[PDB]
Amino acid sequence: GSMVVAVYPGTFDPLTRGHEDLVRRASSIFDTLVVGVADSRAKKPFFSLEERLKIANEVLGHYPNVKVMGFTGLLKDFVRANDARVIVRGLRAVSDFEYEFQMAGMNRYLLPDVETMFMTPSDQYQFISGTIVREIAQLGGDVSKFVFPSVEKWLTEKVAAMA
Amino acid sequence: GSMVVAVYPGTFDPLTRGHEDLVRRASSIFDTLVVGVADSRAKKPFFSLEERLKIANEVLGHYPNVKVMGFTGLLKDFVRANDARVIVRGLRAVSDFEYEFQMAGMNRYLLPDVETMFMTPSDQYQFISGTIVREIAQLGGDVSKFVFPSVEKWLTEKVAAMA
Amino acid sequence: GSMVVAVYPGTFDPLTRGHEDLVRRASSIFDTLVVGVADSRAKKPFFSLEERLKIANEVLGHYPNVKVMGFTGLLKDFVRANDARVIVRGLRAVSDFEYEFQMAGMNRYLLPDVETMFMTPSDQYQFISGTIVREIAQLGGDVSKFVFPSVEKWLTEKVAAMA
Amino acid sequence: GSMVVAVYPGTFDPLTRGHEDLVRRASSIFDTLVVGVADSRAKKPFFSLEERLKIANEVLGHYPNVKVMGFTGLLKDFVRANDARVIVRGLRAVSDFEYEFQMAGMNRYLLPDVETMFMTPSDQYQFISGTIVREIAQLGGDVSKFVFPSVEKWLTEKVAAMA
Amino acid sequence: GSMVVAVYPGTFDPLTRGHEDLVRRASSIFDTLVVGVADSRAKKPFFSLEERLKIANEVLGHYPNVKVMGFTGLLKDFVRANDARVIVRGLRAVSDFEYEFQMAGMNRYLLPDVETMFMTPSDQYQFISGTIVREIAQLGGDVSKFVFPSVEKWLTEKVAAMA
Amino acid sequence: GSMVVAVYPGTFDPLTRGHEDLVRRASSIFDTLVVGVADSRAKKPFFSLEERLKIANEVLGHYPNVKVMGFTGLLKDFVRANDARVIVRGLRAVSDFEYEFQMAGMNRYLLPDVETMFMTPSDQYQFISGTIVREIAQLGGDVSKFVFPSVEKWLTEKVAAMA
Ligand SMILES: CC(C)(COP(=O)(O)OP(=O)(O)O)[C@@H](O)C(=O)NCCC(=O)NCCS
Ligand SMILES: CC(C)(COP(=O)(O)OP(=O)(O)O)[C@@H](O)C(=O)NCCC(=O)NCCS
Ligand SMILES: CC(C)(COP(=O)(O)OP(=O)(O)O)[C@@H](O)C(=O)NCCC(=O)NCCS
Ligand SMILES: CC(C)(COP(=O)(O)OP(=O)(O)O)[C@@H](O)C(=O)NCCC(=O)NCCS
Ligand SMILES: CC(C)(COP(=O)(O)OP(=O)(O)O)[C@@H](O)C(=O)NCCC(=O)NCCS
Ligand SMILES: CC(C)(COP(=O)(O)OP(=O)(O)O)[C@@H](O)C(=O)NCCC(=O)NCCS
Ligand SMILES: Nc1ncnc2[nH]cnc12
Ligand SMILES: Nc1ncnc2[nH]cnc12
Ligand SMILES: Nc1ncnc2[nH]cnc12
Ligand SMILES: Nc1ncnc2[nH]cnc12
Ligand SMILES: Nc1ncnc2[nH]cnc12
Ligand SMILES: Nc1ncnc2[nH]cnc12
């Protein structure tokens, strides 16, 4: 047929069960799925880029056609670097639709030949917010329903270290 | 790489410039794109299924990896019949999001291993409504900005015949 | 300054307190406000066009710079006929946004030099649905909170006549 | 404490797993939950009112504090008749929000002392559309993931009878 | 009947007329309404928790079945502590729906037997934003249409003190 | 006819092609269009007010009936100062609708006789986000598709100076 590489970009602070489900689904469609972890300095992420990469690799490493890579520059440049024809984003019934469609429209100007394609996670992950996950973890609450056990370990350790 | 077939289903009453742009974009990603024209009896389409197939074939025939086919039954069965792993739908900033996400969620129960993926047409087609196109044509207004010339011809002829 | 005519188009089946408030507000801004009552045959209106014009004239006649006129063709043609530079539409927090933005976008193709401008009625009218008004009236319920007394009279008489 | 009766009104054409989950949840909060099945003549329901009542009673009869009753008039009057202080509606991420908030706002005028309260079904039922359920059943597709077995039986029998 | 306690949680920075209306409505339905004022450290509230509690007590103290209490931990724990079966939230036509449904869905995992129920304030309070209230007060503008006189006094004093 | 002044207020950090299109459209309708650049201290703008005024004047100066003015206080006061009867805002399919309708509703309390009117930019500018423009510029990416060349120059110089 053809070889199609897709990029699934995000801050992934941290990778949730929603993100993992999207990776499972997208990697079943595309020949290679590149999970692009953006530095996202201005968003003031809880975990460092190095930490977010380790967290994501722990969860996703077993998928044979998934690559986890960080990037500090423009998504445009990361997509081109990976010879990607598709940007995959998760879209849920409770997504920030304004944000998603603005990004897709602007990336459409920056990368006219690259398609943004939206996929949907399983029903049970449709309502997970990363911001709320971090809030719960910081207040000492368990987030096991929302993130994998390995990710819980990172949250617990980071919360304890910052105190 | 792999051979991935996608289905782009719709009533296509008639095929608009928005639909055509989605076909152009989707057929650039997938090895084969099957445009599935649903009979949609209960929706009381303006054009018959035979007519909608002719209209769509006139516009889309030149695309070498696009197949236009009608179906009178369940989308589930049409997808399986075409060995398709993806259902492509257009999503625009003004889409019926309730409708799209309900269909995707229910098809998720009917076809757990098939992914609904949403794509976006060019900015200039984001606001075209087929219902409004038919309304304009029936009142004798030109719809050339919204549909291809071949489709305009069908609308004009059908409007004249029904009077 | 300048002379600016705006058109406020609708089916007005019947004119509600929400519509009247929009007319009051729009007529305070524009030199002339033309209330365009569309025949809307395909929508199967409860009141005939002649009736909808009488209903609207009863409520709006006192406004010195408001003209109520029917039309059976394209809005494009009605706007041009009235030398209008603006199409006014009501936008409420519970509007059919898909519908409104599709119409505005398509009218933008049909009438590039005419601006669709959205105005908001008072809080107390933001949730009035004409469809629900007709439903209540047909089941013999009072709609005085939603329409003016003159309009109530028309609803009562039409409901009684159809039985 | 207090005795609070709530009404859960709908067309219920037919009762789905989403509706049943809402009944389970609402009946756990309120002393009595009255499921009000509206005749909804103008909506042209697939099942008659008598049929919709039988369908709902089959599914809901086992709940000791749930009453299933039909009504042919105004919801206002049905609520007052049942001494209800609350109207419960399901709200899902894919609800017709325009419709729900218009109804709540208008019922607020009709019944100022009655509160419309929105509840959410389980994630797995958030995307079920009754319209799509009927469409699938009419095309001979199984809807067991969306409705209870007793309801499937009614759909099958009605579809067979209408052919 | 039964004794049902509901919690109405929020940052309440400060309590607005919208919040007060929701308390009035909710306390008419539930046997006890607990207004839970979250510390919300990360949100960087304008008023301290102690101040927000005083502000809310001044407005709400007269309601005989309303309790105002602060909390520094998880909502889950506060709900359980108060033996509450319901979390009440205000939902307006201009609510952050993404945020509300994410919280409800995640609390559904944390507290499966507790129902999030959404209520609607009066039309006249549907468009009040606390963020905009604080912005106006900080720029020396009157917010009496949006908050009670006692709350205005707190805003004025805090604005003057911070300068 | 009449002399109608409208205010188009914003932070304009910086003025984008979307804003410019709205100014072009609004200034064709109103006798005078005042572009009000709010200090917006709390939003922590990238450009100072003086800079944002220079940026906007460079782009908009050629429009004979457009005035660009800064303000540090309440919009209410700026509107009254300019004898304005209309506040114009851009509304796009991807707007923050919550934010826009809250502002309009609250300004409706502050300025009952002033109408907020929403206008729509051309399709090609509907998806431009100022936040994303700043993000791209800070990462050294070209934003020429989103802002005028003069504005690009300001972004480049400010980015270089802050490093
Ligand atoms: C990181 C990304 C993809 C946004 O992702 P996000 O919404 O934080 O992902 P999340 O982890 O929430 O799923 C976006 O900000 C991005 O692409 N950043 C890189 C810089 C860039 O190219 N910006 C222009 C985007 S149009
Ligand atoms: C036809 C289709 C795809 C809806 O398409 P549509 O929204 O009319 O497409 P449009 O032409 O408007 O782009 C849908 O109704 C469908 O799949 N119909 C076939 C019967 C079926 O399987 N229904 C269950 C859908 S979950
Ligand atoms: C009638 C109108 C304005 C829609 O109004 P509406 O939403 O029914 O108005 P309502 O009475 O609900 O406020 C629209 O259907 C129209 O313009 N009809 C005339 C024919 C036409 O030109 N159609 C193309 C619209 S892009
Ligand atoms: C039937 C009802 C509740 C709408 O329900 P629905 O959305 O069809 O319910 P569904 O079965 O889809 O869950 C509504 O149309 C109604 O109340 N009808 C009775 C007549 C009436 O009072 N109408 C005024 C409603 S404000
Ligand atoms: C405070 C609350 C309820 C959000 O309220 P809010 O939207 O700030 O309320 P407002 O005052 O705007 O009406 C929420 O952040 C919360 O529950 N915080 C406590 C910590 C917690 O349990 N977080 C998990 C929420 S799923
Ligand atoms: C600046 C403004 C108009 C918001 O604009 P904005 O959304 O930042 O505009 P943008 O540049 O994004 O187009 C608003 O915050 C404002 O009016 N600020 C002045 C102070 C004020 O009066 N606030 C009350 C607003 S109801
Ligand atoms: N729960 C979730 N599922 C998929 N994509 C997401 N992006 C953010 N949250 C998500
Ligand atoms: N204009 C449009 N573009 C893409 N898909 C669509 N589906 C319906 N209208 C569409
Ligand atoms: N209540 C209302 N107010 C203004 N415009 C409307 N259009 C339809 N309903 C309306
Ligand atoms: N799936 C569903 N769940 C709850 N309420 C509903 N109303 C309509 N569909 C529903
Ligand atoms: N105005 C308002 N009314 C009710 N709940 C709210 N939550 C935030 N603002 C609100
Ligand atoms: N692209 C855009 N067009 C018009 N108004 C806007 N406000 C913010 N972004 C805008």
Author numbering:
A (entry chain A), B (entry chain A), C (entry chain A), D (entry chain A), E (entry chain A), F (entry chain A): -1 to 161
Question: What do the study authors state?
Answer:
Phosphopantetheine adenylyltransferase (PPAT) catalyzes the fourth of five steps in the coenzyme A biosynthetic pathway, reversibly transferring an adenylyl group from ATP onto 4′-phosphopantetheine to yield dephospho-coenzyme A and pyrophosphate. Dephospho-coenzyme A synthesis by PPAT is believed to be the rate-limiting step in CoA biosynthesis.
We prepared a second Bp PPAT protein sample that contained the full-length expression tag and which was concentrated in the presence of coenzyme A (see §2.1). From this sample, we obtained a crystal at low pH (4.6) that resulted in a 1.6 Å resolution data set of the same crystal form as the dephospho-coenzyme-A-bound structure. Since this structure obtained from a protein sample containing the N-terminal His tag and the product-state structure described above resulted in isomorphous crystal forms, it appears that the presence of the N-terminal His tag does not affect the structure of Bp PPAT. A second structure grown in the presence of coenzyme A only showed significant electron density for the 4′-diphosphopantetheine moiety and weaker electron density for the adenine nucleobase. c| map centered on C4–C5 of the ribose ring. The remaining electron-density features fit well as three waters and a sulfate ion (the crystal grew in the presence of 0.2 M sulfate ion). We note that the feature modelled as a sulfate ion is unlikely to be the 3′-phosphate of coenzyme A, since it appears off the 2′ position when overlaid with the structure containing dephospho-coenzyme A. The crystal grown at low pH in the presence of coenzyme A resulted in a structure solution that showed clear electron density for the 4′-diphosphopantetheine and adenine moieties.
